[PDB]
Amino acid sequence: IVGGYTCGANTVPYQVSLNSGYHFCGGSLINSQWVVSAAHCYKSGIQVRLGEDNINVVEGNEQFISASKSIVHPSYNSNTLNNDIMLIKLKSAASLNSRVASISLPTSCASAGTQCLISGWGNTKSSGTSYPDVLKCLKAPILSDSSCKSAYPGQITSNMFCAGYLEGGKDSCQGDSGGPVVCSGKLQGIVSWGSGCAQKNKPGVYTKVCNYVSWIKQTIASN
Numbered sequence: 001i002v003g004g005y006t007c008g009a010n011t012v013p014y015q016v017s018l019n020s021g022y023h024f025c026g027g028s029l030i031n032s033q034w035v036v037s038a039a040h041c042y043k044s045g046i047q048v049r050l051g052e053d054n055i056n057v058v059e060g061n062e063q064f065i066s067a068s069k070s071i072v073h074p075s076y077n078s079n080t081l082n083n084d085i086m087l088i089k090l091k092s093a094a095s096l097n098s099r100v101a102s103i104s105l106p107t108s109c110a111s112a113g114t115q116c117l118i119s120g121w122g123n124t125k126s127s128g129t130s131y132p133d134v135l136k137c138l139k140a141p142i143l144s145d146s147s148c149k150s151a152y153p154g155q156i157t158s159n160m161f162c163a164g165y166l167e168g169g170k171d172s173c174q175g176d177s178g179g180p181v182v183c184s185g186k187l188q189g190i191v192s193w194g195s196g197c198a199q200k201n202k203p204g205v206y207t208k209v210c211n212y213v214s215w216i217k218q219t220i221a222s223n
């Protein structure tokens with residue numbers, strides 16, 4: 001997250017870190033046994049780390065649980081990043097409490113102008129590299145479909161939305177991928193892509209979660 005703030009320990013209780021020896025992506029806990037993340041975060045050997053603030057210090061609220069199964073969206077395309085969504089089943093159910101909690105799925109899509117909370121352990125510089133140890137947060141609005149398509153000609157599908165600031169300076173970044181965009185207490189987006197980070201006229205692009213709720217629910221019901 002570029003241009004954000006320190007969330008506060010365990011204030012984003014659905015935020016997970018995907019670990020393969022090191023943090024490599026975010027995710028969101030959607031029930032005791034399932035995480036939503038970005039398909040472009042897929043790899044084998046994932047450990048889901050719940051209850052994290054400092055990803056380099058054991059602080060006392062962590063739950064570390066291995067993935068038992070990963071399911072990339074059937075229609076994911078890694079060239080275009082269309083359908084940039086994946087589900088991860090945990091080997092055991094997480095213990096849910098005030099600091100480790102699921103986030104509601106949307107029943108309705110969000111609109112341009114809604115404020116949302118974007119979080120992660122990704123890069124905090126736009127023309128530099130600095131990776132934080134504690135979770136970072138950004139409040140940002142959803143942008144119009146037309147401004148999104150104007151920023152990224154020929155690249156925005158019906159499964160993507162933009163959020164952020166066209167002036168630059170405030171955005172998600174590398175290492176935030178897979179993490180949440182939460183608007184009015186609902187998971188509306190997944191950190192997906194963008195040209196650089198926090199660049200003028202290059203807002204963040206997010207997977208549009210409300211398009212996937214039927215797939216998510218039926219996948220959970222059968223797995």
Ligand SMILES: [Ca+2]
Binds near residue numbers: 052
């Ligand atoms: Ca920790």
